């Protein structure tokens, strides 16, 4: 028992972060078999990012101009090329201990780990999810760019996000791993603002789920309610659109437990109407939606890797 | 910028984790060099746990009744000692990706991160702290026992708990790696209650740092307060009682920040007779309490392992 916001063991990624440097700029790079991708700003100064243009600042860049050190091991740079907001170094070695991968686009509301790390070393590890506005609220400080973001599925690591920009607001916005950026934002020292960072409705309810299989049930009413109903409120609160696909997912949580979806939506509904009265659950204060539906099965059925 | 509840990066103790089976029970176990080190009541059955006699459970136990598994790898077990609540068991083989080690007792209020393991497999990693009653708010299943925390300092890992019941109230309980429990707690399915959860003020104090250099700044005020004044109130709020010690720990916070401890005292005390009506601080409606003032300068400097 217990409910934790848990990360996934970090050492297959510990394993791929190493140090890029172009001139002045140091930030991490990804490591996987004979290539190393990081974000294309490491060819930008502080000044560059004000407006610059990649192709014209990359003309200016050879391969010895790209400095990767694995540990305090220098790899050495057989080519370079920019796709999208990446570069891709191709190295002379394959990391040894390049894990089983892919590379995968998350949809908003999707969660995953990321390793915070600086001068390709590990800091930390903690649990993200892709906002519905396309930022992530990470603890990301100078030097953090090129961190990446990922899931595991038994031996298998789908990096979903590596890092890129802090926008003024102090959020975070970056790509997946092949160079496209979540959200409209652009590796540029601009105005971006990001739009609504509205609630994760299906993980909310996910993580009720959770609350109830650890007996905090104090929450649960007498009600039901209907899709449409229960959207109406859910609009008013700047909680996202509940779809049926939603509920499909939440079947198997409503089957453990015995309480209907729509059951749990007017259990919901209530909370957003009342708030919490100075009560708590799962110790959190606020509704909590970094858990999705596989991540609550995942942590109450201890699955491993 | 940001502010995140962050655990160590874990590969350093993924390395070290396997399985020991006893009979019918499987649990986790810790390889460093030639010794596993796991919880005793691997030798029990569920019915053994209401009223074990662990020496004479473990006079009819020999060396070749212990087995370790390391991935899908057979360990030979070549001796067995009970030390307090653990078994050492010890192999023929030393571990070859033992890491620089130590075996530290916490303190109440001191955090680390656990690696939450089912069969020898990493599920998971999670921040956690020792309870001032000397319990952890973990997630631990059925087959967790024997998951540990530990701290990183570079490349030193410090292993402090090793992970041994859940008390009928749901919270949980274990020993540090000579096997003495935290607390009062023992190895027996036996009523075992916890006493009062206080919160952990010097901790709340760094967080809130911590959210003044993130500039969540709306709960700072216009008081001070003296630590006598201030404690009459925390006790009143089962707090735990400020200490010059503490103090001079938040000594660099109040540094780089320009807040007077005792300012920040003065803010934690409105906030504690106001409430928070309804706002957060870094994200949180409750005062978090799961940071150390170590925690927060790490985490707001950037460091590395």
């Known amino acids: 028992s217990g409910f934790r916001k848990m990360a996934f063991p970090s050492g297959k990624v ?18 996987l078999d004979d290539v190393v991708y990081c974000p294309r700003h490491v060819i930008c100064t ?23 050190q694995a540990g305090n091991v220098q790899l050495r740079v057989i080519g370079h090329s920019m796709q999208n907001c990446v570069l891709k170094l191709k190295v002379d070695t394959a990391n040894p201990k390049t894990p089983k991968y ?55 690591v789908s990096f979903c ?73 859910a609009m008013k609160y700047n909680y996202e659109p509940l779809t049926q696909d939603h509920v499909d997912i939440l079947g198997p949580l409503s089957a453990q437990t015995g309480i209907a979806v729509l059951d749990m939506c007017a259990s919901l509904k209530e909370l957003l109407q009342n708030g919490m009265n100075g009560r708590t659950i799962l110790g959190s204060a606020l509704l909590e939606d970094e858990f999705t539906p596989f991540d609550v099965v995942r942590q109450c059925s201890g699955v491993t890797f």
């Open 161 to 233: 996000y590596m890092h890129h920009m802090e926008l003024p607001t102090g959020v975070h916005a970056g790509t997946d791993l092949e160079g496209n950026f979540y959200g409209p934002f652009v590796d540029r020292q601009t105005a971006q603002a990001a739009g609504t960072d509205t609630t994760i409705t299906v993980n909310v309810l996910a993580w009720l789920y959770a609350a109830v299989i650890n007996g905090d049930r104090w929450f649960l009413n007498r009600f039901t309610t209907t899709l449409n109903d229960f959207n109406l409120v």
């Open 102 to 156: 892919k590379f995968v686009r998350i949809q908003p509301g999707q969660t995953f780990s990321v390793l915070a790390c600086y001068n390709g070393s590990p800091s930390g590890v903690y649990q993200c999810a892709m906002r519905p506005n396309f930022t992530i609220k990470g603890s990301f400080l100078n030097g953090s760019c090129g961190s990446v973001g990922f899931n595991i599925d038994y031996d298998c």
């Open 46 to 68: 502080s000044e560059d990012m004000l407006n610059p243009n990649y192709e014209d600042l990359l003309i200016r860049k050879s391969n010895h101009n790209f400095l990767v």
């Open 14 to 31: 510990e394993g791929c972060m190493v140090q890029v440097t172009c001139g002045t700029t140091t930030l991490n790079g990804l490591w």
